[PDB]
Design an enzyme around this catalytic site. Structure first.
Site, PDB file in Angstrom:
ATOM      1  N   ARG A 199      54.735  63.701  75.868  1.00 49.12           N
ATOM      2  CA  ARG A 199      53.781  64.216  76.836  1.00 49.12           C
ATOM      3  C   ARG A 199      52.854  65.256  76.183  1.00 49.12           C
ATOM      4  NH1 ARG A 199      54.588  68.769  81.076  1.00 49.12           N
ATOM      5  NH2 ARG A 199      52.648  68.579  82.285  1.00 49.12           N
ATOM      6  N   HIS A 203      48.904  64.974  76.125  1.00 53.61           N
ATOM      7  CA  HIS A 203      48.070  65.998  76.723  1.00 53.61           C
ATOM      8  C   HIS A 203      47.134  66.704  75.760  1.00 53.61           C
ATOM      9  CE1 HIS A 203      49.293  66.814  81.085  1.00 53.61           C
ATOM     10  NE2 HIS A 203      49.308  65.519  80.822  1.00 53.61           N
ATOM     11  N   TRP A 240      61.478  58.063  86.418  1.00 47.49           N
ATOM     12  CA  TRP A 240      60.943  56.736  86.683  1.00 47.49           C
ATOM     13  C   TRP A 240      62.025  55.725  86.338  1.00 47.49           C
ATOM     14  CZ3 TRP A 240      58.253  60.571  84.212  1.00 47.49           C
ATOM     15  CH2 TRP A 240      57.019  60.961  84.771  1.00 47.49           C
TER      16      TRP A 240
HETATM   17  C1  HEM Z   1      46.950  58.713  85.401  1.00 43.22           C
HETATM   18  C2  HEM Z   1      47.769  59.150  84.279  1.00 43.22           C
HETATM   19  C3  HEM Z   1      48.891  59.996  84.281  1.00 43.22           C
HETATM   20  C4  HEM Z   1      49.297  60.887  85.222  1.00 43.22           C
HETATM   21  C5  HEM Z   1      48.615  61.271  86.541  1.00 43.22           C
HETATM   22  C6  HEM Z   1      50.548  61.441  84.767  1.00 43.22           C
HETATM   23  C7  HEM Z   1      51.314  62.372  85.466  1.00 43.22           C
HETATM   24  C8  HEM Z   1      52.534  62.909  85.054  1.00 43.22           C
HETATM   25  C9  HEM Z   1      53.275  63.927  85.761  1.00 43.22           C
HETATM   26  C10 HEM Z   1      52.860  64.580  87.087  1.00 43.22           C
HETATM   27  C11 HEM Z   1      54.385  64.191  85.028  1.00 43.22           C
HETATM   28  C12 HEM Z   1      55.484  65.181  85.359  1.00 43.22           C
HETATM   29  C13 HEM Z   1      55.399  66.456  84.538  1.00 43.22           C
HETATM   30  C14 HEM Z   1      56.521  67.413  84.850  1.00 43.22           C
HETATM   31  O1  HEM Z   1      56.747  67.706  86.038  1.00 43.22           O
HETATM   32  O2  HEM Z   1      57.201  67.871  83.910  1.00 43.22           O
HETATM   33  C15 HEM Z   1      54.330  63.353  83.850  1.00 43.22           C
HETATM   34  C16 HEM Z   1      55.282  63.343  82.827  1.00 43.22           C
HETATM   35  C17 HEM Z   1      55.222  62.584  81.659  1.00 43.22           C
HETATM   36  N1  HEM Z   1      54.181  61.754  81.309  1.00 43.22           N
HETATM   37 FE1  HEM Z   1      52.546  61.309  82.446  1.00 43.22          FE
HETATM   38  N2  HEM Z   1      50.882  60.904  83.543  1.00 43.22           N
HETATM   39  C18 HEM Z   1      49.855  60.050  83.203  1.00 43.22           C
HETATM   40  C19 HEM Z   1      49.749  59.369  81.987  1.00 43.22           C
HETATM   41  C20 HEM Z   1      50.653  59.431  80.924  1.00 43.22           C
HETATM   42  C21 HEM Z   1      50.423  58.883  79.607  1.00 43.22           C
HETATM   43  C22 HEM Z   1      49.162  58.135  79.200  1.00 43.22           C
HETATM   44  C23 HEM Z   1      51.471  59.262  78.826  1.00 43.22           C
HETATM   45  C24 HEM Z   1      51.632  59.100  77.436  1.00 43.22           C
HETATM   46  C25 HEM Z   1      51.310  57.920  76.658  1.00 43.22           C
HETATM   47  C26 HEM Z   1      52.387  59.999  79.672  1.00 43.22           C
HETATM   48  C27 HEM Z   1      53.619  60.512  79.264  1.00 43.22           C
HETATM   49  C28 HEM Z   1      54.463  61.304  80.036  1.00 43.22           C
HETATM   50  C29 HEM Z   1      55.823  61.651  79.697  1.00 43.22           C
HETATM   51  C30 HEM Z   1      56.619  61.182  78.485  1.00 43.22           C
HETATM   52  C31 HEM Z   1      56.288  62.444  80.689  1.00 43.22           C
HETATM   53  C32 HEM Z   1      57.695  63.030  80.766  1.00 43.22           C
HETATM   54  C33 HEM Z   1      57.718  64.514  80.406  1.00 43.22           C
HETATM   55  C34 HEM Z   1      59.083  65.168  80.574  1.00 43.22           C
HETATM   56  O3  HEM Z   1      60.057  64.508  80.992  1.00 43.22           O
HETATM   57  O4  HEM Z   1      59.181  66.375  80.284  1.00 43.22           O
HETATM   58  N3  HEM Z   1      51.831  60.158  80.930  1.00 43.22           N
HETATM   59  N4  HEM Z   1      53.183  62.585  83.882  1.00 43.22           N
END
Ligand code: HEM
Ligand code: K
EC number: 1.11.1.5
Length: 294
Positions: free
Chosen positions: A48, A52, A191
């Site tokens: 992430r 980001h 997820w």
């Molecule tokens: C419309 C696009 C996206 C939205 C709105 C989105 C939104 C989110 C949100 C709200 C979280 C939760 C963060 C937290 O509460 O810690 C998250 C986690 C994460 N996202 Fe996304 N995301 C998007 C695209 C992506 C993409 C493109 C990647 C990377 C290729 C990605 C990788 C991750 C990963 C690995 C986490 C897990 C982080 C953790 O467990 O600490 N996301 N995302």
């Protein structure tokens, strides 16, 4: 403001071996610090962080992007959209201390590549050369995506990063890792069950689970399944949109295709805004700890 050109510059005298050493250090620490986030480990947060730090890019004027490593500056560090990423940064601190020669951008991006590969994901070719830029080059907050939106929003949002439908659906597959944390984003839940294993489960769950549009403790709507999984409105939009739906089904039914497509899209994401000289070294493909017998 003439759009800047960011030319990749290899860290003085460094080659594949040097970067493989940094990869190994990251991989070894990922293995060591397994207790993090209820035993999910730092893998997900590192991916992430990589996304980001690269996702602030704007194809129109080449601002933002992975090149500058600007997350190290408070403005970006404190971006509400980056809440929780401080954990990934703290993890990388010892790594940077041991290898002070690597640029911040290279470290942030390499951390994502390492995490994906170590979590049994596809190999992701990686290129060095990102150079740290000044605090004034830090992009303003608000360039990362909102989660309470629909397919139209997602499609439009990703056009700024020069990503098409396929690239978007593939990239979103990264949600097969980690989970949402209420305190960080106002969403809660994973997820997938095997959230530290990079596979196509995100797509399978999206298609096979019975989702209910509910409200979490932060008063935000999210899709929940009896199995204990969740999907953000933006994730769910992938099955609501006809075009995205076909691709979701494709990845849910072809693990290798997802791996190849994700690998390409993730490398592209991490390289947006960077001009690689013709004399620059070819992309590096690092061996996992397992392949090295380490
Ligand atoms: C419309 C696009 C996206 C939205 C709105 C989105 C939104 C989110 C949100 C709200 C979280 C939760 C963060 C937290 O509460 O810690 C998250 C986690 C994460 N996202 Fe996304 N995301 C998007 C695209 C992506 C993409 C493109 C990647 C990377 C290729 C990605 C990788 C991750 C990963 C690995 C986490 C897990 C982080 C953790 O467990 O600490 N996301 N995302
Ligand atoms: K998974």
């Amino acid at each position: 403001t003439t759009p800047l050109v960011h030319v990749a510059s290899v860290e003085k005298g460094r080659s594949y071996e040097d970067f493989q050493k940094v990869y190994n250090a990251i991989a070894l620490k990922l293995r060591e610090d397994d207790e993090y986030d209820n035993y999910i480990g730092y893998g997900p947060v590192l991916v992430r962080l990589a996304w980001h730090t690269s996702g602030t890019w704007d194809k129109h004027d080449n601002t933002g992007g992975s090149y500058g490593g600007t997350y190290r500056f408070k403005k970006e560090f404190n971006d509400p959209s980056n809440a929780g990423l401080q954990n990934g940064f703290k993890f990388l601190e010892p790594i940077h201390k041991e290898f002070p020669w690597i640029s911040s951008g290279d470290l942030f991006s390499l951390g994502g590549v390492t995490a994906v590969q170590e979590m049994q994901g596809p190999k992701i070719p990686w290129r060095c050369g990102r150079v740290d830029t000044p605090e004034d080059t830090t992009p303003d907050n608000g360039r990362l995506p909102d989660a309470d939106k629909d397919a139209d929003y997602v499609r439009t949002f990703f056009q700024r990063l020069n990503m098409n439908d396929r690239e978007v659906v593939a990239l979103m597959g990264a949600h097969t890792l980690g989970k949402t944390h209420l305190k960080n984003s106002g969403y809660e839940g994973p997820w997938t069950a095997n959230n530290n294993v990079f596979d196509n489960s995100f797509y399978l769950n999206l298609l096979n689970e019975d989702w209910k549009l509910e409200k979490n403790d932060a008063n935000n709507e999210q899709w929940d399944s009896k199995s204990g999984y969740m999907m953000l409105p933006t994730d769910y939009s992938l099955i609501q949109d006809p075009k995205y739906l076909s691709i979701v089904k494709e990845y849910a039914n072809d693990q290798d295709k997802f791996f190849k497509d994700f690998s390409k899209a993730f490398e592209k994401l991490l390289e947006n805004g960077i001009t690689f000289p013709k004399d620059a070294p070819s992309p590096f493909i690092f061996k996992t700890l397992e392949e090295q017998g380490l």
